[PDB]
Amino acid sequence: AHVVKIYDTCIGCTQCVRACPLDVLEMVPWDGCKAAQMASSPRTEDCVGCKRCETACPTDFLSVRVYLGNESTRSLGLAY
């Protein structure tokens, strides 16, 4: 039940998508960049809060932010 918002400064590196283990992020076409790509966060219900996505964004300041919030079974990474 975490929140993931991507901002206007994305450049279509795809490094955020490759890093997330839980497949929260995917690439969508867009007209704002040279690469003509942008990220997205359709399924944040599966988000866990590892912040590997933030680690990979090479911008001056991040085009991706994970705002932590209410927890859940999927978010807490509980096998039980």
Partner 1 sequence: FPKFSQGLAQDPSTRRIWYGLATAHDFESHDGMTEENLYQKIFASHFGQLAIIFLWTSGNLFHVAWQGNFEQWVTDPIHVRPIAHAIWDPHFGQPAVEAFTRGGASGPVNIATSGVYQWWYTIGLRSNQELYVSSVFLALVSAVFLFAGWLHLQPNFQPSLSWFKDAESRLNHHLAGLFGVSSLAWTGHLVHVAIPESRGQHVGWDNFLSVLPHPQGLTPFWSGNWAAYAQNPDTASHAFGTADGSGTAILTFLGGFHPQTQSLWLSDMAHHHLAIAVLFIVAGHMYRTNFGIGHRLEAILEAHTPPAGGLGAGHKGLFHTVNNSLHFQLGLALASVGTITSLVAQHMYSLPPYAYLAVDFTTQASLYTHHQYIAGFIMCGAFAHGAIFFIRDYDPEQNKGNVLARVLDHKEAIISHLSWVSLFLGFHTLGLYVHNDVVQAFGTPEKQILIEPVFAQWIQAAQGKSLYGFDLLLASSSSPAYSAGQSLWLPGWLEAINNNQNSLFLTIGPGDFLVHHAIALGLHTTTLILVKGALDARGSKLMPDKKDFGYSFPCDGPGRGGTCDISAYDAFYLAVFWMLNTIGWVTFYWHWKHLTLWQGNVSQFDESSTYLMGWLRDYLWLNSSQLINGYNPFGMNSLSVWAWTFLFGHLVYATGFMFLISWRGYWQELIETLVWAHEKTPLANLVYWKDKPVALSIVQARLVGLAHFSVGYIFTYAAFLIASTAGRFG
Partner 2 sequence: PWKQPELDPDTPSPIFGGSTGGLLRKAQVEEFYVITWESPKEQIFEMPTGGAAIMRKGPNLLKFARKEQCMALTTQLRSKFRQTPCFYRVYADGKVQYLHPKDGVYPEKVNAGRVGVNQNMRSIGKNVDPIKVVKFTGSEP
Partner 3 sequence: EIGPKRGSLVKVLRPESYWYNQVGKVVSVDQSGIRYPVVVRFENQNYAGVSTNNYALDEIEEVK
In total, the chain counts a number of residues equal to 80
- Tokens matching residue 3: 């929140």
- Report, in Å, the least distance between residue 59 CB and ligand SF4: 5
Exactly one of 19, 22, 27, 33 binds partner 3 (CB under 8 A); which one?
A: 33
Report which secondary-structure segment, H or E, holds 26. Answer: strand 26-29
Determine the Cα–Cα distance for residues 45 and 72; give it in Å rounded to an integer: 9
Residue 70 DSSP SS3: coil
The contact pattern for ligand SF4, residues 14-43, with x = CB under 6 A and - = no contact, is: xxx----------------------x----
Binding site for partner 2 (CB under 8 A): 3-9, 14, 17-18, 21-23, 25-30, 36-38, 40-42, 44, 46, 48, 59, 61-63, 65, 67, 73-74, 77-80
